[PDB]
Amino acid sequence: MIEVVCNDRLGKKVRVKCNTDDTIGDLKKLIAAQTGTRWNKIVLKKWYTIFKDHVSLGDYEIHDGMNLELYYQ
């Protein structure tokens, strides 16, 4: 099972353990559970490649260690 690094250069270098064939809504739930912010407010980017709340995780094909620039809505 996959380990993801919800990272940022503003005091948030978070390591969430995401599921293999899981969605991103649950990934945002985990990012909130480990980061301390409301669920619907979180945003994930990689140079404006805004990952959405319905596109799956294996769709983009994230793998172990793929860090993601964290931002807030």
Binding site: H54, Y72, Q73
Partner: protein, 176 residues
């Protein structure tokens, strides 16, 4: 310019005059397509014209934070800071709906909790329909009673965070 109302403002003691909304969502409202039009100035009168011509009640949508003109116009009236008489006139307006909705919303964000109950209680009888945009862009038909129930009982009925209005039990023990 979008700093103050005209020259001075009775600062809402909760957070700030303009910053009752989250700074992120505010900055998004500024960097928005709708902010181009109607932001030339809207003090008391043209707000009424710009309000009735938008039959939505919603906050943010889209993957990017997409503010509705409902939310942007709430923020516009917030920066304008009208007097309480106009807000009471809009609260008691039965013909136009969303004007009354905005009156209720601004009264919730700008007003003492006593007056909040006093002016929001009689909005507990409108079983009519209300259009609202979900976060995913899709709309939904919601009753007004459900809206005020989420407003008073629930937190952040829209994208905005609410400034912790009291519980009814304490006020019932102390006042009306």
């Amino acid at each position: 310019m979008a700093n103050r109302t005209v020259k001075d403002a009775h600062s809402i003691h909760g957070t700030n005059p303009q910053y009752l909304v989250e700074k992120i969502i505010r900055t998004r409202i500024y960097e928005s397509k709708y902010w181009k039009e109607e932001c030339f100035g809207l003090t008391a009168e043209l707000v009424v014209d710009k309000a009735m011509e938008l039959r939505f009640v919603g906050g943010v949508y889209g993957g990017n934070i997409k503010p509705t003109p409902f939310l942007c116009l709430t923020l516009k009236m917030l920066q304008i800071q009208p007097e309480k008489d106009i807000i009471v006139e809009f609260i008691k307006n039965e013909d136009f709906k969303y004007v009354r909705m905005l009156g209720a919303l601004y009264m919730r964000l700008t007003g003492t909790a006593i007056d909040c109950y006093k002016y929001l209680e009689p909005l507990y009888n409108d079983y009519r329909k209300i259009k609202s945009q979900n976060r995913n862009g899709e709309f939904e038909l919601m009753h007004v009673d459900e809206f005020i129930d989420e407003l008073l009982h629930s937190e952040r009925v829209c994208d905005i965070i609410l400034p912790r209005l009291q519980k009814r039990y304490v006020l019932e023990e102390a006042e009306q």
